Amino acid sequence: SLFELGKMILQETGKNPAKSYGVYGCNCGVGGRGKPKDATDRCCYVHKCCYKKLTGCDPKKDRYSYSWKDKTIVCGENNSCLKELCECDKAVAICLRENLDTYNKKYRYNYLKPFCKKADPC
Amino acid sequence: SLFELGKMILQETGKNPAKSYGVYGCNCGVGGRGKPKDATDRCCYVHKCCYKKLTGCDPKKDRYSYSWKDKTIVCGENNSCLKELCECDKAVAICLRENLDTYNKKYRYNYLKPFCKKADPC
Ligand SMILES: CC(=O)Oc1ccccc1C(=O)O
Numbered sequence: 244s245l246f247e248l249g250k251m252i253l254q255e256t257g258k259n260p261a262k263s264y265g266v267y268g269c270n271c272g273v274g275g276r277g278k279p280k281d282a283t284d285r286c287c288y289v290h291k292c293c294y295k296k297l298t299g300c301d302p303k304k305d306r307y308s309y310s311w312k313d314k315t316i317v318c319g320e321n322n323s324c325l326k327e328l329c330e331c332d333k334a335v336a337i338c339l340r341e342n343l344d345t346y347n348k349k350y351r352y353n354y355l356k357p358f359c360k361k362a363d364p365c
Numbered sequence: 366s367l368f369e370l371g372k373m374i375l376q377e378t379g380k381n382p383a384k385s386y387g388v389y390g391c392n393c394g395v396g397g398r399g400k401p402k403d404a405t406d407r408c409c410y411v412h413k414c415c416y417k418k419l420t421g422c423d424p425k426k427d428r429y430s431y432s433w434k435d436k437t438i439v440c441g442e443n444n445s446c447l448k449e450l451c452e453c454d455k456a457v458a459i460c461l462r463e464n465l466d467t468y469n470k471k472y473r474y475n476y477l478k479p480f481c482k483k484a485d486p487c
């Protein structure tokens with residue numbers, strides 16, 4: 244669910260997850276997909292494509308189990324869809340941390356999200 | 366379409382539409398519906414419920430016809446879905462104008478939209 248996702252993002256990036264990514268670029272946070280603006284935004288595009296494949300569960304609402312083994316996020320066995328959901332979230336949390344060097348505060352509150360150019364199909 | 370909605374909001378409110386309303390509150394702009402924060406947000410709640418009842422046309426992309434008779438927006442009935450769509454947009458532009466006295470800049474970039482309390486059924 245968004246709660247586990249937020250926790251992973253807070254721990255990997257050190258940033259306030261909703262403030263920093265909740266409306267960022269054409270793909271992060273609320274809304275849908277669009278042509279990515281930068282490397283952070285591409286992380287978020289890959290994540291929304293990941294959610295789009297999960298028909299067996301609800302990515303926004305469904306809880307799942309995961310733990311930390313030293314510095315590694317480990318997704319618990321769950322059921323098939325919930326395990327894949329956890330892997331989507333783990334992957335984007337790591338991606339956002341690795342791309343902090345090009346995070347652009349100008350893109351943080353993108354009130355033009357509905358006018359983004361059309362994204363490539365997932 | 367959102368192009369015409371934008372033009373209606375700019376002329377009725379005098380404000381930059383996407384900047385001032387594109388992420389405002391729990392109901393305005395990108396995303397879905399949520400428990401409304403204030404009178405401006407309730408305008409947007411009514412509008413999203415208005416879009417939901419339309420069938421047979423696309424409220425974000427489909428262009429409709431309208432004109433100005435002095436100060437009055439007049440929807441030309443293209444077909445019945447498109448007339449209703451125009452009437453949804455006219456109503457919200459007038460509503461936002463009448464509530465400028467209560468517009469709160471603090472709600473303008475609501476990065477917590479996904480966490481809004483679930484809206485009542487339309
Ligand atoms: C905007 C936000 O904080 O939510 C999301 C995060 C990841 C994927 C989807 C969403 C959403 O709100 O739709």
Ligand SMILES: CC(=O)Oc1ccccc1C(=O)O
Pocket residue numbers: 357367383386387393394395396413
């Ligand atoms: C989000 C924004 O600026 O667009 C909208 C306006 C009214 C209704 C819906 C939308 C949308 O993007 O979904």
